Amino acid sequence: QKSIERQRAAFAYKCAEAGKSITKSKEYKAYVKNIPMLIKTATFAFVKAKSEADVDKSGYAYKLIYEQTTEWLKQEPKGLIYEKLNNTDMVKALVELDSDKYRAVTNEVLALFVWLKRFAEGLI
């Protein structure tokens, strides 16, 4: 609870358990592992664009991750973006920061998926 590393673990596991019971499942694993590297070389905009709200389509996976990878940033321990995310959308906020904050958030987001990658393969 008081350790950052163990805090991300609790969210990651509940996140993956939400992947199961979904019609299109094996897809979910494919993008989870594909997220990290993409961020290395905006990336969420890609994820935002390819979203579709149906619960039986191969785009629902981005309908989950986007909403799933913003709820975490609300509970961030360091607290990099809390207010700005309360009345906007992730891409609508990360395009409203400066150079310093971008790096801080950049590392934070790439950090969560590391556990998501591990737990995704554990149960999927």
Partner: protein
């Protein structure tokens, strides 16, 4: 028993491995630890061997009281450190330990038990600090490790640390004294002096043990794995002296002065000729174990 004592610090310049022999510990080649606290230390035997080797290989001339004498003479050394003694050293303990941080890259951490032991060890030598030690969860006034309020983020943990105000607190005085007595008179080493004035954090004795035990470097050699103490560690120790063990005045060498005791001449010989860098620990063939020594 011993007459004179003098503290002297040890600062690592590359990872140091004072072998602990063997054990059933996790790693294959572990460092030496106190049995009842798991705090690292260096045994007096290794330190004395290192200092003796540093002294013997040197070549210079110093003035011990009123006579000229080369420091490499076999007879003098044999009379000083003992036959192939009048001088001694105490086991070296850990005073400051480096830990990764989100801001500032790395921070030094110490705990109340270590500081109290340091104060007690400084009592034997007659040096009085002149201020009390700080409480748990405190940092100097000008600390830069803070991020988004009072919280500090060392490693993956987040401790709530209370700053200190008015520049008269215990912790700020401790940091200032260390900065003003842990480094020689300035000759170009300004960065470390400046940093140590602001990047000291005192944490609870429990967490400081969570570090150190699971925050030491581990390397894979070719297979077997070894464990090392991180660079920039700071250690302290004592030098103890007693009058020479002899029977005849002419057999004492230069230490039998007209109006000075043997102990004071031995101490002058030690402190006025000690080299500036010595090698300690094992695996010295690959540049591991160099250290810096200052007396004060």
């Amino acid at each position: 028993m011993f007459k004179k004592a003098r503290p002297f610090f040890i600062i690592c310049e590359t990872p140091l491995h004072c072998g602990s022999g063997n054990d059933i510990g996790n790693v294959d080649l572990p460092i030496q630890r106190e049995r009842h606290t798991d705090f690292p230390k260096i045994e007096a035997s290794s330190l004395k061997g290192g200092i003796r080797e540093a002294f013997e290989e040197a070549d210079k001339d110093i003035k011990v009281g009123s006579l000229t004498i080369n420091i490499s003479d076999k007879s003098t050394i044999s009379l000083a450190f003992g036959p192939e003694g009048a001088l001694g050293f105490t086991d070296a303990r850990i005073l400051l330990f480096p830990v990764k941080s989100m801001k500032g890259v790395f921070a030094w951490v110490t705990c109340p038990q270590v500081l109290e032991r340091f104060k007690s060890d400084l009592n034997l030598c007659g040096v009085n600090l002149g201020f009390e030690m700080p409480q748990a969860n405190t940092a100097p006034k000008d600390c830069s490790l803070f991020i988004n309020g009072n919280k500090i983020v060392l490693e993956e943990y987040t401790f709530e640390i209370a700053r200190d105000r008015d520049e008269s607190g215990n912790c700020t005085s401790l940091a200032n004294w260390l900065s003003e007595n842990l480094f020689l008179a300035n000759s170009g080493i300004q960065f470390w002096k400046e940093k140590i004035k602001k990047d000291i954090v005192v944490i609870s004795d429990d967490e400081f043990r969570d570090f150190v035990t699971l925050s030491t470097e581990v390397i894979t050699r070719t297979l077997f794995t070894e464990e090392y103490l991180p660079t920039d560690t700071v250690l302290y120790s004592l030098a103890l002296t007693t009058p020479v063990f002899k029977e005849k005045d002419e057999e004492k060498g230069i230490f039998k002065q007209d109006s000075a005791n043997e102990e004071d001449m031995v101490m002058e010989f030690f402190t006025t000729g000690l080299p500036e860098i010595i090698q300690l620990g094992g695996n010295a063939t690959i540049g591991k174990g160099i250290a810096r020594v200052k007396i004060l």
